[PDB]
């Protein structure tokens, strides 16, 4: 059933983000430059889940909004921020991969601990500045179904403002970041396929295992970008559909089930990020299992 699997995937994402944060915080050894992007992604996914799951549950299950007038101001805003951050982080992560695979020696710099922190701070600031207009234009206005009132970022002043806001959101949150991530992952896969040939595999079993691991990494990156696209397309298209039809109300069963499916696919994005390094490569499953087995 829908609520059972919803709660299951929410709990899985929550425990994965908590485990990743605890590993990054308590171990105090794997806090180098490459792990900072992973920690930022884990924190963004944790924030996204903790700010979207209870709000979505109270909106769909509960027929009354438990939050007051200000509840539609601080609660939704940060949500988008986290989302943005998450997306941006992945893009940044992709960029980091483009820095670690395409140019192994041509980027061997020294002052990198401060540059990555500055980049993360810039990402967070840009996400907050892009999400601020949501809280600025969020207000409670009635909707003629026969009429209901709840949180809404789009007022009934005109029909051009919600349309252009949804278009700008779809452009800066779906088109450009997904396009950049896809281009970077395609270049990375091409470089991996090219480098998997000049490796002197004549009789070495370790070299054969390394080539198999390289092919596995390429296939896993392809599956990751495919799942990212297949999960971010329905959510964005449903948002565009409900924004273009903002002048009226549509609460059909098909719309309900497709919105639920889009929400689940959007949540699986943040729920699958912490398990990427676990299901992908070794040297990380050991700590990921020990962080949960020490309490067992």
């Amino acid at each position: 059933v829908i609520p059972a699997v919803y709660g299951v995937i929410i709990l899985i994402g929550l425990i994965g983000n908590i485990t990743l944060i605890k590993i990054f915080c308590t171990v105090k050894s794997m806090r180098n430059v490459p792990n900072l992007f992973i920690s930022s992604l884990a924190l963004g996914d944790l924030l996204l889940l903790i700010t979207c799951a209870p709000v979505d549950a109270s909106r769909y299950l509960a027929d009354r909004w438990l939050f007051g007038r200000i509840g539609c101001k601080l609660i939704p805003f940060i949500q988008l921020t986290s989302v943005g951050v998450s997306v941006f982080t992945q893009t940044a992560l992709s960029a980091d991969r483009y820095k670690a695979i395409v140019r192994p020696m041509d980027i061997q710099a020294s002052h990198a601990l401060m540059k990555i922190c500055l980049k993360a701070a810039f990402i967070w600031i840009i996400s907050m500045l892009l999400a601020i207009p949501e809280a600025v234009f969020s207000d409670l206005h009635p909707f003629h179904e026969q009429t209901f009132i709840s949180c809404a970022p789009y007022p009934h002043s005109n029909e051009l403002h919600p349309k252009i806001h949804s278009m700008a959101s779809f452009l800066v949150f779906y088109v450009i970041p997904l396009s950049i991530i896809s281009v970077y992952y395609y270049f990375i896969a091409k470089n991996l396929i090219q480098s998997a040939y000049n490796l002197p595999v004549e009789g070495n079993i370790h070299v054969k295992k390394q080539i198999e691991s390289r092919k596995r990494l390429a296939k896993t990156v392809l599956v990751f970008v495919g799942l990212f696209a297949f999960c971010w397309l329905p959510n964005h298209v449903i948002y565009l559909y409900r924004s273009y039809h903002y002048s009226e109300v549509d609460t059909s069963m098909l719309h309900f089930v497709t919105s639920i499916c889009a929400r689940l696919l959007a949540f699986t994005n943040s729920c699958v990020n912490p398990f990427a390094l676990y299901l992908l490569s070794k040297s990380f499953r050991k700590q990921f299992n020990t962080q949960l087995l020490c309490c067992q």
Binding site: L48, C52, D56, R59, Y60, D63, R64, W65, P76, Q79, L80, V83, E134, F143, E145, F148, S150, C151, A152, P153, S169, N235, H236, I238, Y239, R242, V249, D250, T251, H255, F256, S259, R263, A266
Partner: peptide, 9 residues
């Protein structure tokens, strides 16, 4: 209904 109106998430 009360749902189907709001933000993307």
């Amino acid at each position: 209904n009360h749902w189907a109106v709001g933000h993307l998430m």
